[PDB]
Symmetry: D2
Subunit: 381 residues, 4 copies
């Protein structure tokens, strides 16, 4: 019959009010400083814009071999033009104490190099995936991290994507029952004219074909969805011999893996078919379909049983968790601040490279490769 206290007490006159309700991740500070190395497609389309959403990170400086671009980029994000390094004086960042970490967004073959030069610079490292083009180079990056007593983090965004985490969460709850068969697919049409794609066609720079580039999402995903490691691996690859895009690196490759629990999986990556990011986890109770499974946006998951399809996706008005990009950046910032192990350490990034090598080996020999090497996911998936 009567308005509650608060309503009637609101002044019909201009008056300040308390802080509003938060339905979205609010900014909190920018204490952690980042130095972005490699201003390419991913860096300028996804990572740089992804800072605005961070709660504890900022872009302190840039590192590029194209002075002009690095200039324009500096302006857009207001980075001090004096904090613009190149690949030869990159080490001079050790002087600046405001540059807490470095984000390596360079070709796969250059990752390690700048990670080590970074650690010797006493800075923390955030390296893109795949880690490096060799298991040995991954180990070195890890060795250089422990020496400088710094943290090494691999850019596994899917480890910071709400829907992916929701997927892991529901699976741990045993919503699918006993796990028995995982299926994954990751694809996109390779455009040789794309500046970012040219280095990907060189085995020396990329380290391999579609598997190293996107099939790793299937590999990595199969691992955290099932929450365990493969003990065995089998694989096959094929590329049109008349396609100049696959002279050095593979187009399509298919791998089958077995897990300790007894679960199986089959997946593939492709450079010659359109966008595909689909993961399927089959249990004896229900089946999970993630599609889109690893998109930058619009992921969608569904738990199906005869007669039902329970879909989950980002809300339309509220935002229960920060986006993967911002969440990934702040994660390292957090890790350091609160002195804690990062969820995606150098070891994790090395596991995938080591597994990928085993897979390329299996496809070359047509024989299965034993991958039961006691790796342990510290901190869980």
């Amino acid at each position: 019959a009567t308005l509650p206290a608060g309503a009637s007490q609101v002044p019909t006159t201009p008056a300040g009010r308390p802080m509003p309700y938060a339905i979205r991740p609010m900014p909190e500070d920018r204490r952690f400083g980042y130095a972005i190395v490699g201003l390419g497609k991913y860096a300028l389309n996804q990572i740089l814009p992804g800072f605005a959403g961070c709660q504890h990170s900022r872009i302190e400086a840039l590192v590029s071999g194209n002075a002009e671009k690095a200039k324009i980029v500096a302006a857009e994000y207001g980075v001090d033009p004096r904090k613009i390094y190149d690949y030869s004086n990159f080490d001079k960042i050790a002087k600046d104490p405001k540059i807490d970490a470095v984000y390596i967004i360079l070709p796969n073959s250059l990752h390690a190099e700048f990670a080590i030069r970074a650690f010797k610079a006493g800075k923390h490292v955030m390296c893109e995936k795949p880690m490096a083009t060799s298991v040995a180079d991954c180990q070195r990056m890890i060795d250089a991290a422990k020496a400088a007593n710094k943290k090494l983090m691999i850019g596994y965004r899917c480890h910071y994507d709400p829907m992916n985490r929701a997927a892991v969460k529901l699976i741990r709850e045993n919503q699918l029952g006993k796990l028995g068969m995982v299926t994954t697919d990751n694809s996109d049409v390779m455009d040789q004219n794309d500046p970012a794609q040219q280095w990907r066609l060189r085995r020396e720079l990329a380290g391999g074909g579609s598997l190293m580039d996107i099939g790793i999402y299937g590999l990595n995903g199969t691992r955290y969805l099932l929450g365990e490691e493969p003990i065995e691996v089998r694989a096959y690859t094929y590329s049109d011999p008349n396609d100049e895009r696959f002279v050095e690196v593979e187009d399509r490759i298919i791998w089958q893996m077995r897990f300790r629990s007894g679960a199986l999986s089959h997946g593939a990556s492709s450079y010659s078919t359109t966008t595909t990011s689909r993961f399927s986890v089959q249990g004896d109770k229900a089946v999970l379909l993630m599609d889109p499974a690893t998109g930058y946006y619009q992921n969608l998951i569904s738990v199906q049983t005869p007669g039902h399809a329970n879909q989950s996706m980002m809300p339309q008005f509220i935002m229960p968790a920060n986006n993967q990009f911002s969440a990934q950046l702040d994660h390292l910032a957090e890790a350091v601040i609160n002195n804690k192990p990062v969820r995606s350490p150098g070891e994790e990034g090395m596991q995938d490279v080591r597994l990928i090598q085993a897979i390329y080996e299996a496809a070359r020999t047509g024989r299965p490769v034993n991958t039961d090497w006691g790796y342990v996911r510290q901190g869980g998936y």
Copy 2:
């Protein structure tokens, strides 16, 4: 300003009217008489009920080893108690001209026998899939068919399924661009307490495990979707050794194939996980998702591109085409009446048995098996 002639002409008193518009297949004739062999799960749940929707077929007789069950089923479908046969006096159907064909729905290893006896009895044959448990037996059936000058059709219900034909049509019309990667998955939890599943647990009666039973859908489907034959296959199978269900047949099995066009495929079948029937066909212009892919009901397909998902399924009020069960049944009928070849001939059933053989061989030896033997799909896919 005035009603059309059709409206104003309708009398306002009880009056005869013309034949109505058909928004669904109408019954036409019951010229083709069938003798059903084996009153089991598929027969009583799907085929017998499937007869009602037929436009040229009827159930004329029954053949069962359970007189009690046969008596009950005959009464339910208006079958004359005098036309109930057992497996001993089966051959006597040769004396009844009202029996035009037989439909074998017996376990796998019993197929060839009855197909042959049926042909010796001067009848056409509809045999359930998988055709037989040996390539040789498939050929013997094809031989008996040719010696009797009768038709041999294999129960590939998906070859008469409205949504599957629609998927084949948009592919042939190049809606997906060039085809490069196909993924299939077919699973369902095997229940050893189900009378129907008991013979499936026996290698001698079944001819194999999940591949023979349901993996065949991913295989056959991959073939009719791509519109070409595999020239090579690789595979690996695994089953929990402590599970009483898989002592003789396999639970999970995965296979990879390469086609003359260069396309690749990877699929699996499972006897230990929940209901999955999902086909994916990746083209360089679009991706096709069939899910459910091979259901008895509610099939749904979708053509995806960045930003779009065009779905197709059976309408909610109209029924443009007959269901797969009824259509399959009328297909043999029409073939005989029109003196035309069947779309699912014994040769088609044999190609699958032959391929499954290659797949089992490959999983056994851990090596790729060449399947470039020149099978040619007579009449398109």
Copy 3:
């Protein structure tokens, strides 16, 4: 390590087996004989074919004003040519004990007549909706029913529809929280060239336009979803004056209702737009979307909350419940046999006719019409 007793016991030679597991409603008996009246669109497309799936019903006779059509239909459904009646000798069915009930599928204005003659002939009645074209006529039918001591059931197929019952069940179980707003829409393009639509264009034969024909679904559905009766209605209708289809009946009409609980609803029906059958039920905890809501096939419902869409539809392999056509038919049958009241009695059909009357009145006067007349749903919704 060893197969279960059930598996090892299966003989390897042709042998009789037990009755299989049912993943779908099996035929049981054909005790209840029906006489179908009016071999038109609904009858030949939906009802006659709907008999096959029945578990207690059968077609015993036909009543048509087109001897030619009746002869053809009788042959298609095994009906004895001797049991074909016309509208003149209809009353003679009273002499046949094999005729237990009649199913009136004649245009609206002819319903009451035949329902009454059927009752005078000592038969039960299944009458299509909308019940009649006047409240009085509905009561006369109810009176004839009570005088004959027979049952009167109205063809509300959605009251026996698996997905609609599921929607009613999750609502009753408070899955949507408190109910506050319901939206309905029912449309389809009226084609004056369709023999079936010709009488629908005539006010005298139809009793009204899209509201009487299909608007009734949104109305009836709003009532069974909310589980309560409207106490007040408002409405407005409009039809293009130059369209020959709407000279006598309305094309588009919209209505609003308020219920005792306080809930509100707003829906419409259209004779000029494409296929729409969508029901929305807004609760304070969740929102339910039925779309298609009242299809002959492929119904789908979804319970939405920020970040989720839990879908439910008929399974792809199993059939937990019989279809609405067959179930409706068996419902009257079982009621007679079990000496139990029907769920869709003449009173239910009358409540709708009465409400539609109020709605037309409201649109005519532009004022709200009070409908708080105390109808009570006997047997729940």
Copy 4:
């Protein structure tokens, strides 16, 4: 056989490269300066964070009556603490030539006030919806805009949301055929304890209930989807008399409108049921379903016909157009820069308020209100 020129020419050594391909809206500058007035829920959750994505806008200063908050906010977005005004010295912004415009994000009753004081300050105006609490106050805002020769823009984000524009685009293409029936629903549970909701419960501050707050999306949407104005209106409202939340403003209200083309529509807004944002446009060719229809994120649209559902939504990896928030902000910036009329001028915002008044009037009197007042959408919908 050989890698194309570009691939082989990429240096295996650290080397700068040209600007990458743009798959996402890139930043371009921040020439247009904004002064945000009213730091509430919407301002801090949606508008402030929405600047990072802009290509021509920045946050030059803030205006608040809560010094402390306005401080913290300044820090987070790096706004010069000297450019922090209050509601009494707000006019002092006229001094600063770097403050090109003002974004009024205050209670509905305060909109006009600050718009006029803004225009006299020689600045451009971006006012939130609904425009004001009276047609007269809207006219004054327009008069004050022409005097200062500045631009007036209403915050109709949906006029800058990709999916909404895609929806308008497909409809103009006649993909739905002749338009005949639009249905809309907009709801969310009102929380009286929410600081932002308290003023919304006061008729003096809000100007009305759910209609003024969110039902306006249905009203506005119905207009640009059909691309025309209503000539007539009818409406009804009801709220639980024992609910202290609706003593002064309405909870649920339902309106029906007719359009010149002959199209009809029914819609409603609610403060007592969960999130609902669903628009339906029915044509005689197809039907469009927008659901979510006006979300901040995850909108989804579908074009349905018997057997088809063509869905469209934001891509998962690319981003063809900037988000509604950023797009809205830059729109004004554009309008000014290129000297052009804004798509959402004060007149448009006044049309909705004028229509809403007509609707409240219709519900009060229970009679239809003629709204055929020759309004014209300059620039189209």
